Amino acid sequence: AVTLPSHSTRKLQTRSQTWLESREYTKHLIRVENWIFRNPGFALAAAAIAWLLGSSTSQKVIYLVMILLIAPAYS
Amino acid sequence: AVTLPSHSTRKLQTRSQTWLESREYTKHLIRVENWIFRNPGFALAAAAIAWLLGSSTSQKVIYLVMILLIAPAYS
Amino acid sequence: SQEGAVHTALAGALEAEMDGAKGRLSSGHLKCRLKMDKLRLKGVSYSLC
Amino acid sequence: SQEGAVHTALAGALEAEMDGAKGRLSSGHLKCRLKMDKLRLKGVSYSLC
């Protein structure tokens, strides 16, 4: 169906390479980058929302990054 | 291939139902619930990480929710 | 065969159907102005039943 | 047909092959202690060539 949980959660560890190893790093980066490239307005909105939340600078930056990661996945 | 961007980003809005409308709701909720149910200890890890971050209680709860959201998607 | 991931990648996309070189969409939205100034009544100057 | 979604859903799952009713895995992990006390040296008491 639609969900189909990923097996990388329970990755089997051994010397030999797993099923689809070479695509793990690129996969997530490409998804996030493509979504952000299509929608910059949400980058602005997330910057604003992160600025409103969190006292210190580091808290606001972390909020910005976590929003920018949650948005593409609709997690 | 692996990425395959979702079309719900550009959801075509009209009176008639879209291609797979009845599933979205349970789609995301089921993915998150399943991943958490399989890996319970990460709830404790996220609680600790959220407690270490953010001054007020609301900030810490929001950090907890956003971590528990972003982890199952590996976003 | 990838044909099940594309079906789930499609979400919020409108279905259609096709007859020959023509394709019927069944969900749209059109805006019209109705010039109703040459409309009459076909029932005035009638005797009551 | 869903067969491409499962291929992507599989990640970090090991590849295996099968001969008849038996399945050969080529990635594993075995622990063996080597009792090396009945090994001798064949060359002892040989005049050097």
**Nearest-by-CA chain D residue for A27:** D8
Touching subunits of B (3+ CB pairs, under 8 Å) are A, C
Q: How far apart, in whole angstroms, are the C-alpha atoms of residue B6 and residue B27?
A: 13
Q: How far apart, in whole angstroms, are the C-alpha atoms of residue B18 and residue C13?
A: 6
**Nearest-by-CA chain D residue for A23:** D11
* Sequential DSSP letters for D1-49: --TTHHHHH--S---EEEETTEEEES----------SS---TTTT----
Q: Which method, experimentally, gave rise to this model? A: cryo-EM
User: Which residues neighbour D36 within 8 Å (Cβ) at sequence distance 6 or greater?
Assistant: none
Q: How far apart, in whole angstroms, are the C-alpha atoms of residue B66 and residue C28?
A: 38
Pairing of strands C22-25, C16-19: antiparallel
Under a CB-based contact definition with an 8 Å cutoff, are residues B30 and C44 in contact? no
Q: Do A11 and D12 touch (CB under 8 A)?
A: yes
